[PDB]
Amino acid sequence: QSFLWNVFQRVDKDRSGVISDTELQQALSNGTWTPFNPVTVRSIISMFDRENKAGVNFSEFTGVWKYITDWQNVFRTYDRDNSGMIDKNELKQALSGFGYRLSDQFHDILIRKFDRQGRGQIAFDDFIQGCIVLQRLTDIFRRYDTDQDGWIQVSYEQYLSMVFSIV
Amino acid sequence: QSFLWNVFQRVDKDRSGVISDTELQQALSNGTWTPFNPVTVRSIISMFDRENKAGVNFSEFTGVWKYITDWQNVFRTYDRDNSGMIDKNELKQALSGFGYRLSDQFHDILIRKFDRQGRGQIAFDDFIQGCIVLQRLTDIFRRYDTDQDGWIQVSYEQYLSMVFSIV
Ligand code: NA
Ligand code: NA
Ligand code: NA
Ligand code: NA
Ligand code: NA
Ligand code: NA
């Protein structure tokens, strides 16, 4: 815990015992010399903050640290030329490793939706956000696919509630 | 146009000929003495700005003005006690007037999703945002409901693209 405590003290710049969105963003590198995607930061804090305080305490931060390190290790695996972005094939391999079953064309769609750099590849911070969204959307789809055939049938109002649950 | 020009000059506080999100928000009342929902502001500017400039010029602003006034007139109709919020029954009537076909229970869901004031009713600014979202989601549903029976059948990847189109 000593290592993690030392890291926590450095990130918690106001020394309040709660790391904010701004503090976490400032402590994170996306490997492209631009500020770490604040939407990704918001997602991560929101997932690990158990008390609706717009931040993480030390115990929650240990979760954040492991989460971010785990994502780093995935991205490091697949960014084969260490360019700071992964291409459609590298992304394909990454997501297939997770068990996703997606067509070649979908990988282009995902890159376009989340790549803030406008290069047709995806940087680390944007990759986490895309994956978070993909996981949430896939969890929701799994709930409605009652016979596991890769299709859902939903009414207008089921659909509205489905979209509202994203969130 | 004279009236609209005079209004435009007053809202365009920096006198640049482009009204920003912050300028529009500052010029709008939600009737509850709290700042007008910035998400609603973002939606409205984004819809009327034809040039990706984070704002509206005078001609676009005439559209904004009409849009906001039209919404005001709907809300004024249905806020029968002039309290500044509409209840589930008032909302039901409002949306039915638009031609929406929604169950009584859905109106509770919509209020919960969009009411920032936490009163179980919905204020003007939040009502616009809810309606904007409802219209977009209903347009998307209409695209997929190929036989107009109020149901859709979609594959996993169709569903992902559907959600990605929201936006
Ligand atoms: Na802090
Ligand atoms: Na690369
Ligand atoms: Na199914
Ligand atoms: Na201005
Ligand atoms: Na009322
Ligand atoms: Na149908």
Where are any strands of DSSP class E within chain B?
19-20, 55-56, 85-86, 122-123, 151-155
CB nearest to A157's CB, from B106, B153, B157: B106
Say if A146 is an interface residue toward chain B (CB within 8 Å).
no
> For residue A86, what are the CA distances in angstroms to A4, A28, A44, A111, A140?
29, 18, 21, 9, 26
Experimental technique of record: X-ray
| Dist. CA A23–CA B135, nearest whole Å | 38
User: Is A127 in contact with A75 (CB distance < 8 Å)?
Assistant: yes
Cβ neighbours for A96, distance < 8 A, ≥ 6 positions apart: A102
User: Is B67 in contact with B82 (CB distance < 8 Å)?
Assistant: no
What one-character DSSP code corresponds to residue A20?
Answer: E
| Dist. CA A41–CA A47, nearest whole Å | 10
| Dist. CA B61–CA B67, nearest whole Å | 9
Q: How far is the CA of B127 from the centre of ligand 3 (A)?
A: 35
Tell whether B18 is in a known binding site.
Answer: yes
- The pairing of strands B122-123 and B151-155 is unpaired
HSE-up of residue A65 (Cα within 13 Å, Cβ side):
17
Q: Which domains does chain A have, with CATH numbers?
A: 1-167 (1.10.238.10)
Fill in the amino acid letter for A106.
F
Ligand approaching nearest to the C-alpha of A17 = 1
Residue holding tokens 């954040």? A64
DSSP letter string, A67-132: HHHHHHHHHHHH-TT-SSEE-HHHHHHHHHHTT----HHHHHHHHHHH-TT-SSSEEHHHHHHHHH
Beta bridge partners of A97: none
**Distance in Å, alpha carbon of B156 to nearest chain A alpha carbon:** 5
| Dist. CA B137–CA B162, nearest whole Å | 10
- The pairing of strands A19-20 and A55-56 is antiparallel
| Dist. CA A36–CA A3, nearest whole Å | 23
Cβ neighbours for A69, distance < 8 A, ≥ 6 positions apart: none
| Dist. CA A47–CA A60, nearest whole Å | 10
Fill in the amino acid letter for B29.
S
Phi (first) and psi of residue B56, to 5 degrees: -120, 135
The angle that helices A104-114 and B156-164 make with each other, rounded to 10 degrees, is 20
Nearest Cα neighbor of B36 from B133, B111, B126 is B126
Contacts of A31-34 with CB under 8 Å at 24 or more apart are A31/A84, A31/A123, A31/A124, A32/A84, A32/A85, A32/A117, A32/A123, A32/A124, A34/A117
Beta-carbon count within 10 A of A53 CB: 12
Residue holding tokens 């007037």? B97
Tell me if A113 and B156 make a contact (CB, 8 A cut-off): no
Q: How far is the CA of A154 from the centre of ligand 6 (A)?
A: 9
Fill in the amino acid letter for B65.
W
Structure tokens at A39: 């939407």
Residues of A in Cβ contact (< 8 Å) with B164: 109, 113
- Per the rule left: phi > 0, alpha: psi between -120 and 50, beta: everything else, B15 is left
User: Is A133 in contact with A125 (CB distance < 8 Å)?
Assistant: no
Which residue ranges of A are tagged as binding site? 12, 14, 16, 18, 23, 79, 81, 83, 85, 90, 145, 147, 149, 151
| Dist. CA A7–CA A24, nearest whole Å | 11
Ligand approaching nearest to the C-alpha of B22 = 4
Structure tokens at B89: 């029954």
Ligand approaching nearest to the C-alpha of A153 = 3
CB nearest to B155's CB, from A137, A151, A154: A151
User: Is B157 in contact with A103 (CB distance < 8 Å)?
Assistant: yes
What one-character DSSP code corresponds to residue B148?
Answer: S
Nearest Cα neighbor of A32 from A72, A95, A84 is A84
Say if A106 is an interface residue toward chain B (CB within 8 Å).
yes
Residue holding tokens 């249905």? B78
User: Is A87 in contact with A68 (CB distance < 8 Å)?
Assistant: no
| Dist. CA A104–CA A114, nearest whole Å | 17
Show the CA angle centred on residue A35, arms to residues A29 and A40, nearest 5°. 80
What one-character DSSP code corresponds to residue A15?
Answer: -
| Dist. CA B94–CA B113, nearest whole Å | 17
